[model samples]
Target: MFENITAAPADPILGLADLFRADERPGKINLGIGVYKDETGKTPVLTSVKKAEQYLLENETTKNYLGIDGIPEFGRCTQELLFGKGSALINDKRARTAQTPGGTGALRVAADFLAKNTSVKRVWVSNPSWPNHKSVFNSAGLEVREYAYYDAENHTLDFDALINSLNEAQAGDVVLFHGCCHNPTGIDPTLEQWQTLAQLSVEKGWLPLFDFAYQGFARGLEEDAEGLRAFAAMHKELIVASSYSKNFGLYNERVGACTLVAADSETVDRAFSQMKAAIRANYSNPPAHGASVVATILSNDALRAIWEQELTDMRQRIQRMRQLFVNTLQEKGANRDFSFIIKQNGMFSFSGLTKEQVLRLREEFGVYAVASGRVNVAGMTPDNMAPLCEAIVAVL
Candidate 1:
């Protein structure tokens, strides 16, 4: 049986990492993966996480498991962070929170729960969504559909088309949305547009499932959270899956939470019980180390401040890089205006490079970007920009 199995194709994004490692190029640039790198070209561990680790070393008494729901404090902290403190959703006991392995785990658990319980037959994802979104839902046995989002020709959001497509969704169908800083394509809907989306969801009776993988990376934490807040305010029932990987730099630690908001306490209780059953049958409980660190940081004042400042710095650095990329492309006298890249927020940019162009970039210039032309904007450093831009121009 094992001998008959054929070799699998490489993962589009992660395969680039392997290619880059094998190459002996002196200054190769990798824009394929979504991990953030500092000016020094390092993904630094946060000071808050460091402090939390120190505290745990000094105070932690038990290495025992945390049961199916994982860390209790982590759940509380995540609830407050995602839905603001004193939120009606939280205070009224209409919400249930569960700790998961990470954002992917949260999404999978929620998808499975929805598929098993609800009458939902299909899930609508934005066109050009994070690739894993579809895979996770599909694995849970739900049909996936795409709603219009990015426009390739203009390099901006096709809001009219997007709204028109969403308007066709039926009741009990789930509309998956990026909470902030949409992956692959950094573009986000305006605040007014988000409100309108909430209204449409309400009108269609469609449940909105928010995947918040980058909470603080777009703007600040509070500002980045505006879209989710707007949706929660308008709708009584919603779903949110949040990750600590990008925000807290806890990628390998796999800290995340899945939250379900129902119309009332009884419904919420039932939902929580069902989620617990799912978790019990799955991974049983999330890892404690990362969740504990996140909880400690959010619960304390000094550590939280440090984490916020560090995150703010990272956000600003990415913005600066976007500016630099567009400026240099313009300086190169390219036929196209690359100014739209600067307007798109987040760690990634849908750079609009065709597959042939992307291949040329990797093969000729040692610059690695996704086949879909989704470049990780955060991967650019000052030293790598000129060469990277030259490669881009060559491909163009």
Candidate 2:
């Protein structure tokens, strides 16, 4: 077996992390990875998180294993946050949630559940979706297909092309969508457009699966959920993988939820039973700390407000960085129209730099970005903005 196996290709994103760390330049700026960074270029632990952990330390007594789906409180809190507090899905018991290791874990569980339980044989992702989406589904033995999303040349969402391409999906196909803050592009459809997409899912007879990693990164919590809420409203069945890594700053904690919404309570229960089987076969159960922290903060009004304010701070800082990036590039005589970046939401933007340009940026100026030109806006700081813009302009 050892002789038969060969080395796999390095992951495009994680491999970049390794290269970035190995780079010796003291001032090297990394915008290639997706994690959020503050003005000081630090991924700070949220104050609300600290408070929750303090409470948990004093209160928690068990190191025992959580059930296959993890804590019931975690599941409840996850549902409330994904859907609204007053959502009819909760009252009607149409939705069920299972705690997973992370958003990625949730996605894997979803892939496993679909592959094992549903008749769907294929999953459709956007052409430039998170690099891991294809790998996850492929590993689960489901065929991965692409749908149109961003318009690279125009620097906007290609709505018409997206609709037309998704129309090609056969009934019962699984279509994955970013609930908000689309990865790589940072572009999202407007509410009206989202409504159209929901209707399209209904009209095409496809199932919608939302990878909701950045709940509070784009807009307010409620505002960010509007698109998926539309789907929950129109579609009889749906799947959501929620990651608290970005929103709650719990990257290493590996906290997330896999939620399934079906037509009725019985159907939801049946679906969740299969979901549990998927989890039991995988990691057995999710870690307890991160989910406990999340449930603690969300269930308490004071802690929730504190977390909201922190989230708002993070969102505003990313917004500020986007404006500063565009303005600095203009001031530095970059000959491209990057004003579209300001219109984009969340932490990423397609900088429209070609592969060669991206390489030159890394090699020449020690500024790192993905080969696809997907730069993390959160990684940009006022200190690095000048050199980053100069490097980008020179690369152009």
Candidate 3:
């Protein structure tokens, strides 16, 4: 078995990190990775997280194994955050939540649960989605289909094409949707479009699985959750996987939760039991530190306020960078209008750069971007934007 095994290729984004580290250039900039960096180019830990850690240290608790469902506080806090406190679904026991390793863990659990219990053999993802999305589901023995999302020609959502493809999806098929801040392409459906998708999911009997990895990074937590809330209100059964990595600057913490909304108390109870069994067979339980940190902040008014404000600051900074990028590119006479970058929300923008242009940027100027031209708009800074724009204009 050992002899037959072969080395695997490095991950695309992580591979870029290796390349950047090897480069000797003094002013090289990395836009390939999907991480949030402060004005100082550092990923700072949020104040709330620091406070939570201090509280945990002072409180002094025994280190013991968490149950299969992991931290109860994390589950409860996450449920309230996602579904809203006192929501009818929660109040009536129609929804169940479980703490997982992170959004990836939640997605894997959801995929395994659906593969075993439902007739859904295929999951539909956006045409251009996070690279891991395809690999994860494919490894789970599910066919992954793509639906029209970002239109490269226009640098916008191809709504008509998207709606048409969704309309053709069969009953019981699983549709994987980004709750906010769609990866790769930051373009999101309008409120009306989201409502239409919800209606179609219900009418077509399609199951909706929302992956919410960038909640506060797009807008405020409450506002970014609009799509999930709308769908939860319309459908009796839904699946949600949320991550704290981006918003709380908790990338290495691996904190997240999986929530399932059912029809009633009995269904919810049964679903929770089944999910717990799934977790027991997988990792047994999630880690304690990250969940505890998230719960502590969410449960406290003062800490929660600080976290929200910090999140707003990050969001505004990303927006400012997007605006500056578009304005500078236009001023450079790049012959293409990038005004859509300003309109697109969240940490990413579908920059409409061809693969050749992306390569040229990297080779000529040490400017790194994804092959698909997906730029982490949050990666731009006041200091780096000028050089980055010049590199882009040169490539064009």
How do the predictions measure up, each by TM-score? 0.97, 0.98, 0.96
Q: Per-residue alpha-carbon lDDT of model 1 for 1-396, expressed as tens digits? A: 698999988977778889999999887898988898999899989989999999999999999989888888888888888889978887888888899999999999998899878888899999988887888999899999999998888878899999888878899899999988887778898899999988888988999999999998877787888999999999989999999999899999999999999999998888788888888888887789999999999899999989889889989999999999999887876668888888888998888889999999888999999999899989999998899898888778
Candidate 3, pairs of clashing residues: none
Model 1 clash tally? 0
lDDT of 1: 0.89
lDDT of every predicted structure (CA atoms) = 0.89, 0.91, 0.86
Tens-place lDDT digits, model 2, residues 218-335: 8789899999998898888899999999899999999998999999999899888988988888888889999999999998999999999999999999999999999999999998
lDDT of 3: 0.86
Between 2 and 3, whose lDDT is larger? 2
In lDDT terms, which candidate is top? 2
Clashing pairs in 2: none
List candidate 1 stretches off by more than 4 Å.
none
When 1 and 3 are scored with lDDT, the better candidate is 1
Global CA lDDT computed for model 2: 0.91
Residue 60 local lDDT, model 2: 93
